[PDB]
Amino acid sequence: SGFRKMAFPSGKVEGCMVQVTCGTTTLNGLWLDDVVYCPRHVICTSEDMLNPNYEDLLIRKSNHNFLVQAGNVQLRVIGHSMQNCVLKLKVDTANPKTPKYKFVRIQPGQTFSVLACYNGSPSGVYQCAMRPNFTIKGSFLNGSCGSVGFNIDYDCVSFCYMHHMELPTGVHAGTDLEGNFYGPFVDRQTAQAAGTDTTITVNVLAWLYAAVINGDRWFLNRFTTTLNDFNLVAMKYNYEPLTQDHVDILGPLSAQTGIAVLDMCASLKELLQNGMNGRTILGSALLEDEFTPFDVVRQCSGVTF
Amino acid sequence: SGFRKMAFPSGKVEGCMVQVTCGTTTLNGLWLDDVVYCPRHVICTSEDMLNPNYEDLLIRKSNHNFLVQAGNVQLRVIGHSMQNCVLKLKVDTANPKTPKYKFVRIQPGQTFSVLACYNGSPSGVYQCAMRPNFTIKGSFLNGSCGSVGFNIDYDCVSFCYMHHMELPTGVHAGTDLEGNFYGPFVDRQTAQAAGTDTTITVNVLAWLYAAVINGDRWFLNRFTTTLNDFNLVAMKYNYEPLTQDHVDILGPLSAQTGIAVLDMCASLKELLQNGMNGRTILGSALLEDEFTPFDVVRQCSGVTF
Ligand SMILES: *C(=N)[C@H](C[C@@H]1CCNC1=O)NC(=O)[C@H](CC(C)C)NC(=O)[C@@H](NS(C)(=O)=O)C(C)(C)C
Ligand SMILES: *C(=N)[C@H](C[C@@H]1CCNC1=O)NC(=O)[C@H](CC(C)C)NC(=O)[C@@H](NS(C)(=O)=O)C(C)(C)C
């Protein structure tokens, strides 16, 4: 028993991290087979960052201008190309530590692990959610770009995020591994704002089921609700609408605990209208929305990779 | 910017995890050089667990009774011995993935990462604190014993915890890698209770400095306090006494922000006496005590391994 914010084991991704330096700027890259993926702004100087023309800057760079290091070993670059906001550097050596992998584009509300890196070396791993406004609440400093986010399924690493930038509220934005940004953001130093965020309702419900599984049951009430009436309340508290797809995805936790989803909705409705009155759920004084139904099942059932 | 509960990268420890089975019970083991370390209760059956005589049970076991698997590969056991509450199984093959390592016994208030494993395979990584009552708030299921806790310093893994058991409140207890329990616990299925816990004051202060570094400064007041007067307040709210050693350890964060430790103590005293009035600090509605000063510096300065 117990419930923690748990990240995926990071070893498979650690063996793919490299350092990419072009001129004076060094960021991280992801080395898979004979290709290194990194943010395109590695080719910018400080003056270039207000409004860079990346295609122009890349035209003036040749393979040898890219210094790629894997540990203390230089990897020789033999080709380069730009795909959306990422550079693909072909190297003359395939990474022998390349895991089975896929590039996926995750949906808002889904979670992943981030392996935060500097100079191609890992500093830590934490779990994040793709927010409804297409930002993540991460922890990233200068030099962290090219750090990646990922899920693991058995032996397969699904890379879903590459880190590019920080937005005024202390929140983070990036691309999938094809270089397309999540959200309406661009890779330039100009004023950009995230849309208003919203609470991921299906995830709060998943975490309430995690609490029941752990014996923290005080908030269960005796009522039920309709899906339509729940959503009228959710709306006022800035919660996403709950869909029938979300109800189905909560099926395994509902079946395990014997609490119908609409009954858990009635209990959540009460928490939203009345507060927690100084109580905690799973140790938290606020309702938590960064665990998916799958995360709850995986942690409470001991799924391994 | 941003502040997350961040675990160490787990790859170095992942390459050491193995499965140990004796009879019907399977737990995890730690394979370093030619030795596998695991909890001694792998040799118990269900009937044995109320009050096992481990020395007696081990006398009746020979090397071949221990089935050790590293992935799909059986490792042949060639010797066995018991050290306190851990078994040491000598195997005929040294682990080629053994990192530089040390066995350390950590002090209450210190943090570590746990790599939770089942059947020798990792399921997730999370950060934990050794509580003042010598328990940890983890997330562990049947089969998780032998999962380890660790810190990393550059290239060196300091193993400090091996998981053995769960106590009535949903909290966890274990040993160092020499098999000595943290706390007054024994490895048997009998009623055991943890002492009353207390809040790790130096860590709350460290996290308040993390908040200042991130721009969350609303709680800073205009006052100072003496160390003695702060401790009189801390006492009433079940906080550990702050010592001059703790004040010195907070020196780097104090110097970085220009806030004297005793001035931050005055601000904490106000939070304890008055509450947060529905506000949050770094997103949390409760004061957080599972970040050490070192964790704050490492995360806010981008320390890598
Ligand atoms: C990548 N190494 C770095 C990560 C930032 C640095 C501080 N915290 C982070 O997450 N990315 C940047 O510095 C990017 C670079 C451009 C070309 C996208 N710039 C920013 O993130 C910028 N924010 S913005 C796009 O102007 O609103 C900063 C530097 C003002 C944070
Ligand atoms: C190790 N695999 C297992 C980990 C437990 C299982 C549930 N959550 C955990 O953390 N450890 C045990 O089952 C130990 C075994 C003995 C010999 C120490 N037993 C317990 O943890 C026991 N608690 S106790 C010592 O009786 O208070 C349980 C099974 C009642 C939780």
Reported as half-sphere exposure (CB side, CA atoms, 13 A), residue A277 has a value of: 6
Query: What single DSSP character describes residue A60?
Result: T
Q: Say yes or no: do domains B15-99 and B198-301 share a fold.
A: no
Let me know if domain B1-14+100-197 sits in CATH 2.40.10.10.
yes
Beta strands A148-153 and A156-167 are antiparallel
Q: Which helix (H) or strand (E) holds A30?
A: strand A25-32
Give A248's contacts (C-beta < 8 A, 6+ positions apart): none
**B220's tokens:** 């800073």
Of A16, A117, A145, A160, catalytic: A145
Q: Please name the residue whose Cα sits nearest to atom 28 of ligand 2.
A: B166
Ordered by start, the domain boundaries in chain A are 1-14+100-197, 15-99, 198-301
Of B85, B145, B160, B265, catalytic: B145
Let me know if domain B15-99 sits in CATH 2.40.10.10.
yes
Ligand 1 atom with least separation from CA of A168: 27
Q: Is the CB of A99 under 6 A from ligand 1?
A: no
Q: Is the CB of A247 under 6 A from ligand 1?
A: no
B64 is catalytic: no
B172 is catalytic: no
DSSP A221-276: -S----HHHHHHHHHHTTBPPP-HHHHHHTHHHHHHHT--HHHHHHHHHHHHHH--
Query: What single DSSP character describes residue A180?
Result: P
Cβ <8 Å between A125 and B9 = yes
Q: Among partner residues A4, A8, A11, which is closest to B138 by beta-carbon distance?
A: A4
Fold of B198-301: main proteinase (3clpro) structure, domain 3 (1.10.1840)
Q: Please give the Cα distance from B184 to B135 (Å, whole number).
A: 10
- Comparing alpha-carbon positions, the chain B residue that sits nearest to A165 is B1
Cβ <8 Å between A137 and B285 = no
Q: How many CB pairs under 8 A join A and B?
A: 156
A276-284 contacts, C-beta under 8 A, 24 or more apart? A276/A219, A279/A218, A279/A219, A280/B286, A281/A207, A281/A208, A281/A211, A281/A216, A281/A219, A282/A3, A282/A207, A282/A210, A282/A211, A282/A214, A282/A216, A283/B137, A284/B285, A284/B286
Beta strands in B130-256 (DSSP E): 148-153, 156-167, 171-175
A52 Cα to the center of ligand 1, angstroms:
13
Q: Among partner residues A122, A139, A302, which is closest to B141 by beta-carbon distance?
A: A302
Residue in A128, A132, A184, A162 with CA at minimum distance from that of residue A7 = A128
* Cβ atoms of residues A256 and A296 within 8 Å: no
| Residue written as token pair 């040491």 | B88
Q: Please give the Cα distance from B289 to B237 (Å, whole number).
A: 14
Cα B304 versus chain centre, distance:
20
Cβ <8 Å between B14 and A15 = no
Residues in A closer than 8 angstroms to B2, CB to CB, are 137-140, 166, 170-172
Residue in B157, B177, B153 with CA at minimum distance from that of residue B15 = B157
Q: Where are the alpha helices (DSSP H) in chain A?
A: 11-14, 54-59, 201-213, 227-236, 244-249, 251-257, 261-274, 293-301
Beta strands in B66-108 (DSSP E): 66-70, 73-75, 77-83, 86-91, 100-103
Cα A215–Cα B183–Cα B33 angle in degrees, nearest 5: 100
Query: What single DSSP character describes residue A182?
Result: S
Q: Please give the Cα distance from B214 to B277 (Å, whole number).
A: 21
Q: Please give the Cα distance from B102 to B87 (Å, whole number).
A: 18
Q: Please give the Cα distance from A113 to A103 (Å, whole number).
A: 14
* Cβ atoms of residues B49 and B145 within 8 Å: no
Q: What are phi and psi of A80, to 5 degrees?
A: -150, 150
A112 Cα to the center of ligand 2, angstroms:
30
Cα torsion A47, A52, A53, A57: sign: positive
The answer for B282, left when phi > 0, alpha when psi is -120 to 50, beta otherwise, is: left
**A129's tokens:** 């959610």
B164 Cα to the center of ligand 2, angstroms:
7
Q: What are phi and psi of B121, to 5 degrees?
A: -115, 135
- Comparing alpha-carbon positions, the chain A residue that sits nearest to B13 is A11
| Residue written as token pair 């994040």 | A128
Ligand 2 atom with least separation from CA of B138: 10
B51 Cα to the center of ligand 1, angstroms:
59
Identity of residue B127 = Q
